[PDB]
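User: I'm putting together a teaching handout on how multi-component assemblies are represented. Below are the sequence lines for each component of a complex, exactly as they appear in our records. Could you produce the 3D structure of the whole assembly as structure tokens, so the students can see both representations side by side? Please keep the chain order the same as the input.
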Amino acid sequence: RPLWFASKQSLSYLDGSLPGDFGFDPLGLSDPEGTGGFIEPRWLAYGEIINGRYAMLGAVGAIAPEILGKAGLIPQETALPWFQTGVIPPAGTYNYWADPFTLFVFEMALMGFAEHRRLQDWYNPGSMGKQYFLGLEKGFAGSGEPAYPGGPIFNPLGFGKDEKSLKELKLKEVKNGRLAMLAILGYFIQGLVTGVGPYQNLLDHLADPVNNNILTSLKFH
Amino acid sequence: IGSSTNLIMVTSTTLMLFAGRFGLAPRDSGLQTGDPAGFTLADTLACGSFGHIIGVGVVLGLKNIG
Amino acid sequence: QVIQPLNGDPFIGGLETPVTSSPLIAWYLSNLPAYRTAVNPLLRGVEVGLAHGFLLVGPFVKAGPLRNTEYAGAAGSLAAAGLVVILSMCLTMYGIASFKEGEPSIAPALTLTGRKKQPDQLQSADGWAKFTGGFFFGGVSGVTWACFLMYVLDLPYYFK
Amino acid sequence: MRDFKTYLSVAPVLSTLWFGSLAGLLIEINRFFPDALTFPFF
Amino acid sequence: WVTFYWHWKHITLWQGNVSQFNESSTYLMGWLRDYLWLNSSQLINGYNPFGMNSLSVWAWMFLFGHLVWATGF
Amino acid sequence: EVKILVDRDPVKTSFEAWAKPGHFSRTIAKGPETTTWIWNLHADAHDFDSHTSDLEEISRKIFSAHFGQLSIIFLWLSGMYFHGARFSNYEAWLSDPTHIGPSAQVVWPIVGQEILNGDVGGGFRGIQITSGFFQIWRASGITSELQLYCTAIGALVFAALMLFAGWFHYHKAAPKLAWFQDVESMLNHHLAGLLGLGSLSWAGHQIHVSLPINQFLNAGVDPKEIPLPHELILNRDLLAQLYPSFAEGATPFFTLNWSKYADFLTFRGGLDPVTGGLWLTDTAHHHLAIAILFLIAGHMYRTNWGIGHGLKDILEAHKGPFTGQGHKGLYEILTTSWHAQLALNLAMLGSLTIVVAHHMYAMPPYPYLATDYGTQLSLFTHHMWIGGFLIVGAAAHAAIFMVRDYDPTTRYNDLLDRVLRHRDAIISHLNWACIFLGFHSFGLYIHNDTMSALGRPQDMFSDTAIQLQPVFAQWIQNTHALAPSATAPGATASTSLTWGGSDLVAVGGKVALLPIPLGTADFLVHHIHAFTIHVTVLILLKGVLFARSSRLIPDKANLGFRFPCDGPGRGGTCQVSAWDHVFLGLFWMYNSISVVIFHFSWKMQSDVWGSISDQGVVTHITGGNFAQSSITINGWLRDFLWAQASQVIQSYGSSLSAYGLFFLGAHFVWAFSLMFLFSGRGYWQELIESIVWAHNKLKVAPATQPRALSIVQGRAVGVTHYLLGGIATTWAFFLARIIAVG
Ligand code: CLA
Ligand code: CLA
Ligand code: CLA
Ligand code: CLA
Ligand code: CLA
Ligand SMILES: CC1=C(/C=C/C(C)=C/C=C/C(C)=C/C=C/C=C(C)/C=C/C=C(C)/C=C/C2=C(C)CCCC2(C)C)C(C)(C)CCC1
Ligand code: SF4
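Assistant: Of course. Below is the structure of the complete assembly, with chains in the same order as your input.
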């Protein structure tokens, strides 16, 4: 098994069972001794998976409108950098069909449902197949593993029926997730330093490599 | 760049890393790496940070002196 | 190990320190008149009185109520002599309070090494009486000598 | 709930509630009937 | 208390200023200010950096009494 | 090995322990048999070392109590920010700081108390505050009440977070003992992450927000027309107009061309002539350098990676011939005793508070702080009192360590043993030093009083008489006055205006700071200070050293840390405990701090504070009478107490009448303390017997049998009321005097 910056303490609990395990834990945050709160190794892996999935959504969602505007696919007024779409009102605001606080309330309610349900699956496995919820609860029974519930709603195409295929797909998911959250951190830092958007940063790097670097950007903007 | 500051900082960092690697300069351990002397990432960061501190001080002193 | 127990004894209320048992400090203390056991207490009293009466004149002359007048040299010096007349008096009372006529000296008869030593005659009625008389004589002599040096012979001085 | 009501029945909490109610009553009386030196109702 | 009352009433009567006692003895700040603070000016000014007068002995005994009152504490 | 060791759900959250008083210990949970139990219930409430013998539960209770204290502090800060947002004249004070008195509290119109709403200025009626929050907010760049409201809401949220964390880290996820004993990681995080990162973030705030807003304010721009602090972040050119180096970005930092940042990072020194405070660029550079020093000072101690230092090895490496084994064994003492850590931290924090008060009076760091005489006096006096209390508590808990946590069978230290072996020499030498200092410091005052009373002013210890000049302090002042010339050529001006020179800063016709002269009076007062400090040290150190045993009571440690006596035997063994030594040292700390604050008040009123005429002359508040009057006790009684009490005894009928009422009430409480201090329990118990008979005659006697207060509790009540009265007296007197005339 390949190991990247593995430690003697880290190898005492990282035995390769979890997907994407390379022994990397210099700080020992997943140590199973004195474990409580949110520092549980299962909770840490679950949070890594959820953060990776959300960042795989976000790293494409924060760069797709800019690419579509450059390609002239759908109108350029909706083609803005990710900080110019009302996320940061000083950076830019777009006039949607609703006030940003009203949209925040709508999002908060919908995700409160869709995420407190997930939290109660984590607390009590299989508890969302019991109570009546619009008749959809039959698809919310889960599989005993909170990060990978499966079922006809979350796994409709039936991908990875085989165990080796499931393990390979889990490894692919965690690796692409880690890359995506690295990309999201890069988006944030490039917005803080340059402030022109990540796709514009890529275009400036492609047009000239020497004049547009991390080194020739410390002047900020 | 290649200026005096670049040369001083590169020399200080390289000298501190060499002193921490080969020289005597460096119950709670566990980090492992591939180099044979056990010069882990923590030792690399420590030597680089100390060399950076020394080089920054030397540069800012020589700038005032001339 | 610099701080030792007092003469190798850890159960005596004291300690041996470089301020206590240095050879130079022990020599200096042993050569003081108060610790000269084999000498007549009259001579040691004379020396002690001379030193103390000599050193007492300065504060009285320089800080007295008449320090800025012509009578600074005499009256303050007289005050110093008066203090000696007080001090010896106190000593005399001590000599009557502590020591009796019929008792011998109460001074220790041993040394640090534990060898037999003749006790000091100072801790006795006759010895302390002789010491007090010598102290009075030395005190008045020292006050007179200080007055003679500063104001009668007119030796040059900084006078503080 | 019984334990919380027992805690509310302990000496400092009950004294605080009673004296706060009394102080509020006296303050409101002094607002509505201020500067009272005599009893003039009779 | 008895001698404070006597001295203040008589020292306001002798000055022909009994209104000061009649208006200031009903509250303790009047006792502190118009009796203790007001009547002690010449007492504490018995000796100053500018000289001294015949009340210097009373100032010295005043401070002596304060000191020996505080020493028993 | 340094991991997060936490056990889940150790204590059940329930109100069952709320319903039972005194649940923490056994002798108290049995129920009250007498009234004394009630007092005991408020005496052992926070003594976690007596409730249980396990260090883990004690440490968890300590951690959650610290969280609750932080929540209370955040609640108090939210209250101050709210009362500065509403019920305040901060916006009015911003326009005219030199003529409008700060105010953040208004009283309600009931029972005639609305007279306390004084005309502070700015179209506002309310209580004038002296906490100096307005100066902090101006130094922070706050120019609106909405910002104060937002800060209050954030502090309320932070208080709720602290309370939730305190509940969570005891009832849900409690740290283990080894988590608390990881002192190396704690020191690293508190030096690099708490102090270093906090200083770096505050330097960033000062550079990006406080500097441009304060530049606009000092330029005469109206506060409502000043650009918002976020506008100077989004627009770098707006900040670049004031400081052109911002046009270069962070490249001068990364290329080590730090001298390009010499427009907002200056080593100027002195005070700002416009505001009378320290330059904010100086504070920004100071906090930046402090952050760098703390961040490189936080990577010292060893952790999971082999680099770093071991505290145990560092301590064990220092041992000399005089001290024998040296500092070996101190690590195990300090890592297994909370009382030793409390003693050390209390002493250090009290000394830090004292030096904070001195350095704030000497260098006002906020705009329009020096010219606010009430704020300066209140801050100095308050932090003096806080420092004295913490220093007393240091010895108070060192005694608890010696009684309870000290044992030589295990956790034996050679240094502590050698200290305890020669304790008689230490106490006797300090006794002689106290006697010598008392004589040659207070007998000089007595001598001056007698010479002045006898009509012999030429025989006193005055400037126009026998002179005791502080040559060393004057030489230090002269050296620090010429520091920019030779020793510190990079500083434009001196570190303060209180050394010397022709410099003088005056804002709005009031003197901010002056070169403070030092003479015979300062000499006498400073040696009085040394005498009082040495006596307090003597009392506290004697209690700490003899808390275990002495020649009188060889088994005093078995009697406990806090016991009344050992009977009338051996001639009387009253107040032999170390608690009584703390109780005695409280009075002496009170005396020392009272003399210190009296010295500060009179010296700054006579030689520093005052008014500047248009011609150029300076007239002080008391006319510079400290040099000739403060050398005698009669001068302190007349020209300081009697003369300056006229502003607090004549405050009736005005807005300062609350200070007169507090003056009288504090005198009353101070007198009331003498009843507990001078009496004894037996007489009060015998009187309570007759009162109990009177109640029993009418069938109204209680089941809880009334008992007189215990001996230790009587002493505690006496000293508490004594300190409260004697401190509130000075509080009211200082506040009324410095608000009416300053
Ligand atoms: C979202 C957070 C996150 C979390 C919870 C995990 C969780 C896990 N990782 Mg994964 N990982 C991540 C991100 C994360 N990872 C990223 C970005 C990478 C690529 C660099 C990897 C690559 C990786 C490897 C190679 C390995 C793991 C492994 C582990 C396991 C042990 C280590 C640990 O306890 O992590 C707990 C971590 C945290 C709580 C995250 C926060 C830590 C601080 C707060 C980060 C601050 C950094 C941020 C950039 C600065 C803020 C700036 C911002 C404001 C702009 C655990 C299952 C081991 C394994 O066995 O896999 C199963 C292993 O060998 N991870
Ligand atoms: C770098 C991070 C860090 C920080 C900032 C702190 C800071 C603090 N710790 Mg220390 N501590 C740390 C690491 C850290 N600690 C570690 C690793 C250990 C274990 C070895 C300890 C062990 C420890 C103990 C045992 C105690 C403290 C206490 C405290 C507080 C005392 C200082 C004070 O109140 O000033 C005022 C400071 C602030 C209000 C500024 C803002 C700091 C924010 C509010 C704190 C968030 C920091 C936290 C460590 C990270 C969040 C965790 C996450 C799960 C939410 C302070 C909040 C004492 C206390 O007061 O506890 C309640 C205490 O009893 N610490
Ligand atoms: C004589 C030299 C000496 C001196 C002058 C000091 C002085 C100081 N130390 Mg101590 N210390 C010493 C020796 C010394 N120490 C040794 C040898 C050790 C190793 C055992 C320690 C361990 C130590 C730690 C681990 C910490 C200090 C801290 C501090 C400062 C306390 C801050 C405060 O006032 O509260 C103001 C508020 C806070 C910031 C402190 C919060 C409360 C702390 C976290 C609790 C102390 C807990 C401690 C680990 C006890 C655990 C008992 C365990 C064995 C069960 C104080 C200035 C603290 C510091 O670094 O502050 C920056 C701190 O975190 N000290
Ligand atoms: C910095 C924080 C600090 C901490 C955490 C502790 C911790 C503790 N102290 Mg130490 N102590 C400190 C500072 C501190 N002390 C200081 C500064 C002093 C000097 C005064 C002392 C002096 C001291 C003594 C003398 C004793 C302790 C003891 C104790 C323990 C129990 C406390 C108790 O039960 O009281 C619970 C709470 C109370 C009794 C509250 C009393 C009310 C106070 C005195 C009034 C304050 C007046 C207020 C401002 C006026 C408002 C008016 C009113 C109407 C509201 C506990 C270990 C005790 C001990 O360990 O016993 C064996 C003990 O004997 N401490
Ligand atoms: C206000 C008056 C007062 C006075 C004068 C004293 C005096 C003294 N206290 Mg006490 N004390 C007091 C109130 C007072 N206390 C109170 C209220 C408390 C309650 C907390 C205490 C509790 C207390 C403690 C707990 C301690 C003392 C100690 C001391 C002694 C140290 C000072 C010293 O020796 O300097 C020299 C003497 C003095 C300044 C006294 C005045 C003498 C003047 C200068 C000269 C008199 C002239 C000369 C003798 C001529 C005599 C004339 C002839 C006819 C006889 C000293 C005897 C400390 C001590 O024992 O240390 C040695 C000590 O630890 N005191
Ligand atoms: C691979 C390998 C190798 C090589 C290696 C190398 C060469 C490396 C390098 C490395 C490096 C290259 C490192 C570095 C590091 C660094 C660091 C870590 C730094 C830090 C910094 C700091 C810490 C800073 C600080 C500061 C600031 C921030 C400001 C203020 C001042 C000061 C200075 C303090 C060899 C061939 C041998 C062999 C094989 C293996
Ligand atoms: S008077 Fe009180 S404190 Fe003194 S010995 Fe008797 S019982 Fe103990």
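A couple of points students might notice: Residues E 67, 70-71, 73; F 431, 434-435, 438-439, 442-443, 446, 535, 538-539, 584, 587 surround chlorophyll A (ligand 5) (CB under 6 Å). Helices of chain D lie at 2-8, 11-32.
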